[PDB]
Structure formats: C-alpha cells, structure tokens
Design a protein around this ligand. Structure first.
Ligand SMILES: Cc1ncc(C[n+]2csc(CCOP(=O)(O)OP(=O)(O)O)c2C)c(N)n1
Ligand SMILES: Cc1ncc(C[n+]2csc(CCOP(=O)(O)OP(=O)(O)O)c2C)c(N)n1
Ligand SMILES: O=C(O)c1cc(O)c2ccccc2c1O
Ligand SMILES: O=C(O)c1cc(O)c2ccccc2c1O
Ligand SMILES: [Cl-]
Ligand SMILES: [Cl-]
Ligand SMILES: [Cl-]
Ligand SMILES: [Mg+2]
Ligand SMILES: [Mg+2]
Lengths: 538, 535, 525, 172
C-alpha cells in the first residue's frame, strides 16, 4: 500500500514523462514534497533531468530556456503561496512567445482556503487569461478499491495539461497552470511495506494519444506585385516565398537567400507586404505596417494573428502564389540591401570608441553553423539585426514575448542545457554544440542570480555569456552608473569570467570550459552619433 | 494640460492622507503622476524610491508601510509590473498592509497592462478616476471629484471603514494646483472606525493565550500564560515558552490574531475538547481545524486564573527555558538557533527587528525573545522567503523617518534583520540602491548561513531514511560567496562567529551592513531532539 | 464621433454575415441602436426587439442555429449581463456564434470563462485628419470579433463580448475588411475496423463516410453518417470491443455505462479542439479516421438482430400501454415529419423519447440545446430557429410555402419560457412554427431516476414531481397565440394542416405510469 | 451511510441553527441530497420549504423572503444554467445588501473540462457580486474522520452565514 499523495505524484510524473517532458525545474518546499520525491526518483533512473533552483521567478525563465532550446514541454514545480505568484513573469512571457510551460503547483486542500491556514492563497485562477488552461487535480482519496479509476482520471487530466501546453489540438502552445492539492502524509511510507505505481498504457504510450495536428488556411497572393516579406517571432518556413526580399528578425527562421536590411525598407516603396509571424523589433517595419495604402497579408503558424497592422487584407497559414516578382524589383531590393550593409560597415570602422554595435558585429562574425545564439531583448537583438547576421544554420533564441529583462541569464542557461541534451540523443560522440549569449550589463546584473546553480545540479557544457557593459523621474537611476562589478557577481556565484577587448572576442570565443562570462566594455556616449552617422550614410 | 493638473491634485490629496513614501520603477509608459511625484520629491513633501526590479520594489513598499504604519504607493510602468507585483500584493492582502498600486491606462487604445487573475481576489478596491476633461468652469467640481476618489482609495487601503487594511488598485487614465480643505486636512474626513465584538470568557477555567500575527493588545488578559509569536504585540508579563505547551493540559484557549508557528500550537488548536475563542482586530478570523467556538474583538472577563494553574505553567516554562539553554551550550557546532539566541540578547529597547521566514522566526521564539519595547516585523501573511531584504530596507527607512521627524538629536534607532541564506539569496538584488535613492542609516542584516534550508531537517522529509534523496530536493546547497555578493553591490559585509555577533552589533558601521555567520544544519535535527528529551 | 463609429461597426458586421440582431430596450447603446435601426429599415439586417433579456439571448441562439450564421445581441441595461448569462453558457458549450454588444459609458465572473474573446474598441476620438485609420482599426477589430465567434481560425465557435465604449467605406464588393478562409482542422486516427466496433455520435459530430457501415447509435441532433442505425436500448445486449465516439454524447445511461467501461477502448473524433473524457478511458482523439480492416459479418449480424429486437419491443409495449404518455407523443411527432422539416427538441424526456421512438433524422434538421441541457429558453430558441430557417428559404426564392418548424417540449419548459411568446406586432413572427407541448403536469424524467423509486413515493411529490396545474390554453390566448388541445391520434393530421404562423398544440400525457412502461420495455428485450 | 446524505444533513441543520427559516428549492437530479434533507426539515417544522420551477424567479422569491423579516434565506438548485439564472437576483441582493445564500449542487470539480453533461464553471460565476465564494470538500467515504468532517462542514456553513448576514463586516 502507498499513501494517496505518493501514489498521485508518481502517476502524474509518469504521465508527464510519457508526454515528452524531458526536463523539470523544481523549487524546494514542504507542500510539494510528494512531487519532489517522485521527480527525484525519475531523475535517478534517468527518465528525466531534474534542475533545482531557489528563486522561483528565475526558475520559470530557466524552464522557458529548457523549452525553446529543443521544443519540448517543460514543467516547473513549486510549493504553495508566493512561490506560485513568482511564476507570473515567466507565464506572461510564455503566453506571448507561445512556449509550452507547465506550472505544477502544490497546494493545501481547497477546504482550507478562507480558514487562515499557513502559506495558503487563491492559487487556482491566479494567472487569469495568461494561461491556456487552469486545471486542478482532485484531492487524492484513500480508496484502494478505486485505484484503477483514479489512475485513469489522473492520467487523463495530465494529458489534457500536456495537450493544452504544446497546442496539440489548438496549434496555440502556451503556459498551463496545473494545481495539485495535497494533504498529509506528504512523504513516502516505508518502502519494504510499499507498493507499485498504477501502470499506464503499454509501450510507454500517453494515456490519451493525440496525433500531430494540421491547421491549414490557404491564401492567394499575386507575387508579380512588388512584395516585401517581413518575418518576426514565431514565423514559419515558406519555401514558395524564398525568392522574395525579406526583412527577417534574428529569431525568425529564414526561408530563402534574398535578405533585405531593415534600414533599407524606408528607402523602398513596396506595393504589398507579406507578414510572417509576429514582428515587433524594427520601428521602420512598424511604420510601413501603419501605412494604410500598402496591403498586408499575414501568415501565422497558429490561430493567433498579429495586430501590428490595421490594413491586413487577409490572414492565413500558407500562400498559394501566382506570378513571379519583377526582376527589376529584385534588383532594386538587392541593390539597397548592399547599400545599407556597406553604410553600417563603414560607419562602424570610422567610429573610434567601441560601442554595443561593435560587440554585436564581433559576436556575429564568430558564429559558426550549428551554434545557438541567445539574445537579450533590449539592444542585443536590435544590434545583431543592424549588424546583418546570417541566421541560416544557427538557432537564435530571445524572449520576444514581452521583451523583458527578467530571466535572460536563466533562459540562456536552460536553452544551452536542452540544446546540448538533444545532441546526445543523436548518439554522436562529438563535442556538444556551442551556445553563445549576448546580453547587456543592466540585464546581466538584474538576473545575475540566474547564474546560481547548486553543486549537484546540471551545468551547461558549452555556454558563453558575452556581456556588453556600457554602464547603462524614474530614469534618474540611469543618471549615474550602477557601478556593479561583473567580475564580483561571477565570483559570488562561482562562475569563471574574463574581461576582454572586442578584438579578443573572436579568438577567445573559439577556445573550447563549461560555463563562462566574457565581459566587454563599450560606450553609450557616442551611440547617438554612430546611429546618426549611419542614417546620413544611406 | 488637465492631466498634469489632475496628477498634482491626486499627489497632494495622497500626501494629505498620510502617504510619505512612493516606490517607482522605470518603464516604457510614463509613470502615473511621475512629474507630480518628482515635484513633490524636490519640495520635500514626499520621498521617492526608485528600483529596477519590480518584485523587490513591491516588497520595499511593504517594508515602508509596516515600518511605521503608513499607506505606501507603488507606481507601475511596464507590461511586467503586474506579474512582478503579484507576490507583494498577495502578501499585503494576507498581512493587511495598506498598499496602493498606481496604474495609468489608456482608454483611447484598443483592449482585447498585462493583467493576471489576482487583482480580483487580492485587493480591497479597484477605483478608476476617469479621463481628465478640459473645462475651466468645472475646475472646482473636478477638484472635488478627484480628491473624493483619492480619499476613498486611502480609506480602502487603510481600512478606515472596514477595519481590514490591504492593497488597492488605483487607475489614473491618460490620453497652479486647485486647492484642498484648509489646514492640510483631507477632503473627506473618515474617523478610523472602532470595531467592537465583546465576548464572554471565564478565566477560572485553565486558560492559555496564543497570540499570532495581527493580534491585538488586551490588558484584561495580561495575567494569563501567553504563547506569543514574535510579531505579536505583547500585553502581559506572563510569557509561556512554546515548548512548554505540550507539557500542559489547558481547558480553554484564547487565540489572538492569526497564529502560524509551532506544531504544538496547531495540535492544541485542533483538539475538539479544548474550546478556542478567537479575538481579532478585523473582520477575518482563523479556523483551520473547525474548532473555533466563538469570535470577538475583546474579552469581557469574569474570574481569575487559579494560582495553581499559574504555578504549573511557570514551572513548565522554566523547564523549557532550561532545556533550550543547556542543550545549546552542550552542542559544539553553531546552528541558526545559536545565531538567533545571540541576536536576541543583543537587542535594546527601541530596536526594530525584522525576521525572515523558515527557522529564524521560529528560532527567535525558541530562544525566548523579550519583545516589549521592541518592534518586530515579519512577512507572516503568506510566509514567503521572497523579498525579505527589501522589506527590511523599507522598514528601516520608514522607521528612521519617523524618528527623524520627532526632532530628537539622538542617532536613528537600529533595525536588525535576521534571515537565512536562501532568504538572502532569493532577494539579494534588493541590496542594489543607487546613490540618488534613500539608503538606511542603521540597517544591519544578519545572515545565518547554513548553506541550504535547515527547517527541512526538522520535518518528516528530514528523517534519516531520506538522507540519500533529501539533499538535492530539500537541502538545496548553493555555495554562494555572500561576502563577494555584497561587494558587487557595494555593501559593507563581514563574516563573524556567533560569539562576536553581540559586540559587532553593539557598535555602529555604515548605514547598511550585512553580518554573515556560518552555521551547521547537519546537527539541527539532533539538537532539537535533545532539547525535547531534556524538557 | 460615436455616431460614425457605430455605423462602420454595423456595416462590417453585415459584411461578416450577420443577418439578425436582438435588442432589448434600455437607457444605453443609443448610437448603435440607431445604426441598427437604419440598417433594419434599409433591409440589410433584421431587428428583433424583446423585453426579457434572458429570452432575447435564447432567441439569438435560435437565429444562429437555424442557418449557421453569426448573431448579435445588444445590451442596453445594468441587468443585461446577468440576464444573458444562461444563453452565453449555452453558446459556449454548444459552440454557437453569439456576439454580445456592450457600450460601457466609461460585472460577474462568467465573461472571463465563457466567451471566446473580449474586445473593446476604445473611445471615439475626434480627429478627422485620421478618419481613414480609425476606419481600418474599427473594421479590423470587428473582423476579429466575427472570427472569434464563428471559429474561423480556431474551429471553435462561441460567444464573444464586443464593447463599443461611449460613413467611410470598406473593401469594394461588400467584402469583409480582413478576409479569413474557413480553416481546415485535421488530425488522423488509425482505427482497425475488424475489431467489433460501435459508433456513438452526439452533439457537434461530423460526417464520416468511411464509418457509414458500422452500427451507429446517434443522438437526434447528430447528423447521420450512414444507414446502419443501432437502437440505444440494444447496447446493453451487445459486447463491443471498441467504441468510436463522434462529437459530445450526453444521453442514454447505457451509452454512459459503455463509455465508462475500462475494457472497451474509446476513440474520440471531434470537429473542434475540445474532446470529451468523463471516464478517463479516451484512448485517442482525432478529427477523422484512417481505417484498415472491415467489420466482422458475425458482429454486424448480431447488431442488426438486437436492433430489430429493440425496435419491436418499443413499438409493441407502446401499443399495450393504454394511457397516453410522453413517449407516445414523441412517437407521434416522429412519424408526422417529412424531408425538409426542422425539428426543435427540448431537454429532459422529449429529446430522449424521440430517440427511443426511432426517429430517422435523414432529411430533417434537428436542433436542441444540448450544450448544458437546460429547460430554459426553449420557446424563444424555437422561434429564432424558425425565423432564421424561413429566412434562408425566402432568400432562395422557391415557389413553395416556408418549410415547417416543429417544436416538441415538455410542460415545465413551456412555462419556464412562456414569455418568449410575447412578440410585439412590429416584430418578426415565424410563419410555419408549431410548438407541440407534451403535458404530464410535472417532471416525468424523475420517475425514471432513483428518486422515482416507489420507496420515495411520499417524499418525491414536492421536490421532484412539482405539479403546477397551469392552464396552458389560457396562457397562450393571453399572449395572442393560437392554441388547441388535441389527442395523440390527431397530432399527425393537425400537424399536416397548414395553420397560423405560431400554433401551440397541447397533448395531455400521463407520468404516473411512466416507470411501469419503461420497465415493460426493458423486460421485453 | 452514503456521504452525500450525511453531508447534506449537516449543512441543512447548521443553516437552521443560523436562523434560516425559509429555503427555496428548484428541481434537479444533482441537488437531490439537499432536496431530501430539506424536505425532512420541512416535515419536522424546522424550516418552510418553497419549490419553484424557474430559477430566476426563485431568486427574487428568496430576496422577498429575506427582506420580509430580515433573516438569511437560502436558494438551492442543480448544476448548469440553474446557477446562471440566479444572476439577476444576486446582482440585486448585492446592491441592496440582502442576505441571499445561493446553495448550488455541482458535479465533482474533476469533471470540469471533461465534457460531462450539465457541467459549467460554477465556482466564481458570480465574481465580484458575492460577499464570498465557499466550496465544501467533496464528501469523503471515511468513517474514521466523521467528527473532523462535521467540524469542517459546520464551520464552513457558519462562514457562509456570517458573510451573508454581515455578522462581522456590517455588509450583508
Ligand atoms: C517564495 C517561497 N519559496 C519557497 C518557500 C518554501 N520554503 C519555506 S522555508 C524554505 C527554506 C528557507 O531557507 P533559509 O532562508 O536558508 O532558512 P533556514 O530554514 O535554513 O534557516 C523554503 C524554500 C517559501 N516559503 N516561499
Ligand atoms: C434551467 C434548468 N433547471 C433545471 C434543470 C434540471 N431538470 C432536468 S429535467 C427537469 C424537468 C423538466 O420537466 P419537463 O420540461 O416537464 O419534462 P418531462 O421530463 O416531464 O418530459 C429539470 C428541472 C435543467 N435541466 N435546466
Ligand atoms: O487576524 C488577522 O490578522 C487575519 C488576517 C488574515 O489575512 C486572515 C485570513 C484568513 C482568515 C483569517 C485571517 C485573520 O484572522
Ligand atoms: O465536440 C464537441 O462539440 C464538444 C463541445 C464542447 O462544448 C465540449 C466541452 C468540453 C469537452 C468536450 C467538448 C466537445 O467535444
Ligand atoms: Cl508527512
Ligand atoms: Cl539585454
Ligand atoms: Cl515560515
Ligand atoms: Mg539556511
Ligand atoms: Mg412533464
């Protein structure tokens, strides 16, 4: 015989594994001990990798990283009370970035809500419309005669949680709140007088199998009309559009070989626009989408479609193309793209001081096919886009959902861990692929506690964090530098760090060292002149 | 620009309502009342605090409000502000902290702020002002409407009518200053209500008082044996050690406030043979077991405790105190209980004490802290380990500000925080205060560092049969260099031994310093079992 | 400024397929009511005014399920949100495109859980230097509302809250501002038909040609996929090894017992992203089946034998029973239907008894509020269903009278929504709607439940039966509606007789013998 | 003794001790345990039962029963739109401060989302219009804990009554 809380936790953990969950983030507590015990045992048998963290807020962004690194649903488990509320920021990010994040909260029994019990709040529903679903398991009953029926109901609810999070039937992945009320006894009973977990379906199959869904919405587009493609976060790959001039955000997957620099778009006159994904980065892009005279055709992978344009003529998922672009239009767009690249290149060289744009250019040139790049959503993504990075053959991650500074370090760490984990499944005996992160100093200092990894927890094998330190009424905290020593922060969290120059950045990134932080000074003073010089050069 | 005029009307009425501190974070949107708050800051009518981390900003506001009992405003500015403020707002609801959350929505924008679901369940009120309309003739009527909504917001936050203080959402939408009542009086005067529910209690029945967070002060119960949590204001001279409770058989329990500590208390409160009388200061009342027989706000007492009962309680109290003292001395390694004892013996009348969750708030009550003359703060609302550093900082700032505004030439009184290492790791970023922002002048954070969560060694998951599995999932060692952490944030820090803790606290240092004491948690369970065996 | 914002929104809703709007008088939504009034006088939209806001919601449900079109309801009061609650819940669960229009001059929890979207336009600012950008913003948002309501991109139609807080053209050729092709939601399931399989199809099911040969228990609202029906009462006489469940089945305890059987795998095929699993035995979900094998001939033989046995045991035990019951009235209405008719069923016994009588749904359109299975709103639902259905036949222009809409409801249901018969003289009235009322003076379904056991005979009269003694005939005449008390035998001929646009036919029925009649049918199987 | 019946009999008894003299009942299958326990209390003269068919009109009947003499009044109904029909009466009871206890039966909460018949998001439907939204635990079959389940059930009933009558908030 097994106590009810232990049985329920072992069933849930088993069904989550069968649904593709490979990594679980756990935060310590007493009320979530049943989940903790069952997760620890699955990690001892090698069925999942467990990542323990102390701060639930940054642990939520770690889980986002573990999910975007390879595309698998990731659970984060914590105790009752403000621990659940600390997942707020990650849940908002995962909502707008469509990240399959399962928030697995332990709770007191609902009967205690309103009694004044310790560490108990209104947990179910806390996340509102940010989550794709708020699902509660029932309090586990002590009914050995009903063991088979309770197993079917727990595994079915778990599959609903997994389906809603991965978007298996909605094509709209996102975060899910899975709340589990738990009561004493919370620790497993003596194992000699123990029992076996109620089994699932045979052959490691999910309890409710849901096969791959196809969400199809064709759209007719005449490509002979002068067309530009603008691809943002969450865009899909469209091979029938690969020839068109394309302004692509760094995180957007590239369809073709005809890039168009974002600075070139204002100097051209497209007659119609194809919007892929959710573009938000570039401001001239936003200017063109506000232009009411230019028809916009939106192509999304899911049912959500962006509000970035008011003259959206149609929304679909793929294009049924008629015609071909004027060769003179392709020539003009290619000509302007080269002009914009040269203008950026020349003005960086003419600039004396090293700026953040220089570091971004230096990181972009040091990337090799197969690398993963993680970018802070402030200046790093804009700077890499102005530098003209070729994203083909590399995977680029960034928290573009709400583009916050919270959790950027933890996201890079998680993405590096999932990326390296997927490289072992291929059975290859090579070295793990590189993960390079480029983040600002203010972002790094704000999520420096994301560097904290207990001595027994997984550490990324090939992660390098490049910190572009530019030392910068509510804006009066930027009137002075924050003055924090990046080296001191790294020592506090036992992390190797080096201060280097932009010339050294390339050759130092090629040195094969676990996790490390590479700090590069830059100047914010001259940035306004450099950007003004680039615009005058066009 | 009427929107600018509106902001000065609200800020002025907020200052008339008792607001002395506002917390801001930079964000995409202009802050609600940002420039009116800036004008008020330079003129000395209000004090601004700016932070980058919105989570630590919320908990700083909680500290500013519990340090002296004043309402405090927090100014949201971004699309992450609601999610990051959630923890502080939840804690303000359960600890009854007057917290005003200022927001600035756009009614000309299309909808359908990144709102979650907690605003509905956590706040006392949700008041919007309405768009500032241009009308030079209705300026005296608009002034009255804006100042009435502001007085209503402060009343809901402080519980002026409900006796249930808590957080309030105040929205001021955006697309000289008109005057208020004379002598700086608020627009709408509401006397702080008196909430009265007298209850009959016979004190001849063997009775114990158990007072928790939010407990009132009761002079007619002063003689009874009393198990008081650290945050409860004391009203008697007859304290009863929490470890003495299971050595007695009370026939009656008076519960003051909301108790959350000591499983011996929970066992006694759940015993259906022992009537429990709940005396609370607000409308809510605790009933975790279902054994709360009656509720009230004050006791109408008949009789007095039997002299033999008081003698029995005092004898068991002396056995409990001796067991804790003798077993602490006979134990080689320093634990958090040793650290808590040293801090307790170092406090002086007038000190403010801030206690983190986990073992520190329990250990101080096991050491027998005398709380009279002392101000004790702790986030017992939801017992989170998040935001405790910023709560201490805010509590010190508000506490020092009240002493400064009495004009006493003496140095500001001390605020001493006692927190675990995970608690410090959780909110270490709360230490980053820009040179422009107010910094405490007498805040000392004592960090009892046992490299993980020591309380789990004392629970069921700390039983030796889990010794192979409980290190990763409960102990959670981190190996953080605390001194290196405080250096990066430019905060004075010193690692010392428990016997040096007393003298180091007695002398002053920088306005803000962190004292770290290395402690052991591998002997923690053995030390507590030996204390129980010596009772 | 707000006057042109209302006119553009109304124009885009009409371009989006809205043909009917329900409005309740009140001191609000004045500009939108004007724009709607203008379009009603222009012939672009049909306006329906009601006084009861709860009946107005269920009327809009009917106008939507009658021809599958989006329908709007305009709130104008500080009680409308509470009164539209029941209809919004029904629209959520039955996936009905209901657009609820508000106009907050600057609060229950159901809006957060029940609706597909909550969109507010924003205030109508006064800047004629940007009137072409406000035009697109208003027609884009309105296209989002229409798309969320009809499931254009989600394949999950439902209610939408559209708030316009208190004339420039659209696309040429009357097209919607943002075109969205109806989406294809596909998810194939591998099913082996050589296993002994029964199909159980409920509310919201699709049509599956590769399943037309399998024995099929179909709820009346389910569109039949083939021509091998299996009577529900035959199910406990069979031992299927596999169940294909279409849509959302909600009727028949044998069906419920079978789906709960953990030995029998269940394969759920749904037209949308939601799927049922009350038991936890759902082995897989999908939208269509990829089939191998073929059903065993012995299995088909057994099923067809139980089917005829169940049909015969019902048709004969109805003859022996002398008293007229609700099961007889359902049988009578079922044989009085011809292809092209629309049949509206109330919940409780009427929708179950029609299934026991063996109605052949082919050629008939069957409506019923199975989403939450409420006895409220059925009268106004049938009126709206008739109006929408007759409006579609009128737009084709056939040289034939409007097709018939027959409603079969219980007594309690008729008095629960009696105020749905209060239709003002200026208001559109059905032209071929006949409401048949089976009246056994109480709730006859409770006689078939555990509280209907003879050991609760002296306690179950008050709390389950609830006689009302209401004179149905007088209630209809008070509302200026034709009524006639007929017997079960004259039901058919009276129904065949073309009559007034609205007729209520009352048939007396017995419920004291209902538990005996269902036990006699059970023993004859 | 089956737990639903014991649970329903404890709640009804404690409601009566709290001053409830009138209860409005609407017919349904899911609220059978409350219906039986209420009928038993009407036969004994402890309360006066009132049966109605329409839940919307039943809520205004309970409001009348409350303002007639100033006592808390209950309205019990089944799951589904039966609760949604109490919407208009709850709104009126909120603004007029009438102690109206909406006593709703429900399918088990684990059935929410499974497509079960007559199951909706009931808990929280009324939102900000109620003084409190309290659920009892699903009655467990466990004779060892009957005394603990009694205290838990009666304490919750008292919280319902105090919030409805404003016993400690002065805001019925
Ligand atoms: C926000 C939050 N997360 C998690 C918990 C669970 N919890 C309770 S005590 C504790 C350990 C705290 O350790 P520390 O601060 O080092 O104190 P110690 O008990 O070792 O003195 C934890 C994680 C909590 N109460 N709040
Ligand atoms: C709004 C609502 N309230 C209550 C119920 C519960 N219920 C189900 S069947 C029924 C009785 C309906 O009786 P009637 O319409 O006369 O039908 P009969 O079963 O006698 O044919 C009731 C009250 C419901 N489904 N909907
Ligand atoms: O007395 C208090 O301070 C207090 C505070 C609270 O937040 C409570 C919450 C639930 C139940 C009782 C509570 C209570 O008695
Ligand atoms: O297929 C349908 O029509 C349908 C409709 C619904 O409203 C559902 C609600 C919950 C669960 C399943 C559902 C479902 O399968
Ligand atoms: Cl335990
Ligand atoms: Cl950054
Ligand atoms: Cl604690
Ligand atoms: Mg510790
Ligand atoms: Mg009837």
């Amino acid at each position: 015989h097994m106590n009810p809380s232990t049985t329920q936790a072992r069933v849930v953990v088993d069904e989550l594994i069968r649904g593709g969950v490979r990594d679980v983030v756990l935060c310590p507590g007493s009320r979530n001990a049943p989940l903790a015990f069952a997760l620890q045992d699955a990690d001892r048998s090698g069925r999942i990798r467990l990542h323990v963290r102390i701060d639930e807020r940054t642990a939520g962004y770690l889980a986002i990283g573990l999910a975007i690194g390879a595309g698998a649903p990731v659970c984060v488990a914590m105790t009752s009370g403000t621990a659940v509320a600390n997942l707020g920021p990650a849940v908002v990010e995962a909502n707008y970035a469509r990240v399959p994040l399962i928030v697995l909260s332990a709770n007191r029994p609902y009967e205690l809500l309103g009694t004044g019990a310790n560490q108990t709040m209104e947990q179910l529903g806390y996340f509102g419309t940010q989550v794709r679903a708020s699902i509660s398991l029932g309090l586990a009953e002590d009914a050995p005669e009903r063991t088979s029926a309770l197993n079917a109901t727990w595994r079915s609810a778990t599959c609903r949680v997994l389906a809603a999070a991965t978007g298996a039937r909605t094509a709209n992945a996102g975060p899910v709140h899975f709340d589990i009320p738990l009561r004493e006894p919370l620790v497993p009973d003596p194992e000699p007088l123990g029992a076996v977990t109620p089994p699932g379906r045979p052959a490691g199959k999910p309890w409710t199998y849901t096969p791959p869904v196809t969400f199809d919405q064709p759209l007719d587009i005449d490509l002979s009309v002068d067309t530009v493609v603008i691809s943002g976060h969450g865009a899909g790959v469209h091979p029938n559009l690969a020839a068109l001039p394309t302004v692509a955000e760094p995180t957007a997957p590239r369809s073709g070989d005809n890039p168009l620099h974002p600075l070139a778009l204002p100097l051209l006159r497209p007659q119609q626009v194809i919007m892929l994904g959710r573009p938000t980065l570039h401001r001239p892009v936003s200017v063109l989408l506000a232009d009411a005279e230019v028809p916009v055709f939106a192509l999304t992978t899911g049912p959500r479609w962006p509000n970035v344009s008011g003259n959206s003529q149609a929304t679909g998922t793929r294009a049924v193309t008629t015609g071909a672009p004027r060769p003179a239009w392709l020539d003009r767009c290619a000509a302007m793209n080269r002009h914009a690249i040269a203008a950026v290149r020349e003005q960086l060289a003419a600039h004396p001081l090293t700026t953040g744009l220089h570091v971004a250019a230096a990181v972009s040139h040091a990337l090799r096919p197969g690398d993963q790049l993680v970018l802070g959503a402030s200046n790093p993504v804009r700077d890499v886009a102005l530098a003209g990075l070729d994203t083909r053959g590399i995977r680029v991650r960034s928290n573009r959902g709400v583009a916050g500074i919270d959790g950027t370090v933890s996201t890079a760490i998680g993405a590096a861990l999932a990326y390296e984990g997927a490289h072992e499944r291929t059975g290859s005996p090579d070295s793990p692929p590189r993960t390079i992160a480029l983040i600002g100093d203010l972002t790094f200092v704000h999520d420096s506690s994301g560097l904290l990894i207990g001595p027994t927890e997984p550490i990324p094998r090939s992660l390098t964090i490049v910190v572009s330190n530019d030392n910068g009424v509510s804006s009066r905290i930027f009137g002075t530098p924050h003055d924090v020593d990046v080296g001191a922060l790294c020592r506090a969290y036992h992390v190797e760090s080096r201060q280097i120059e932009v010339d050294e950045l390339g050759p130092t990134l090629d040195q094969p060292a676990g996790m490390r932080v590479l700090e590069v000074k830059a100047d914010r003073s001259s940035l306004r002149q450099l950007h003004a010089a680039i615009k005058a050069a066009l």
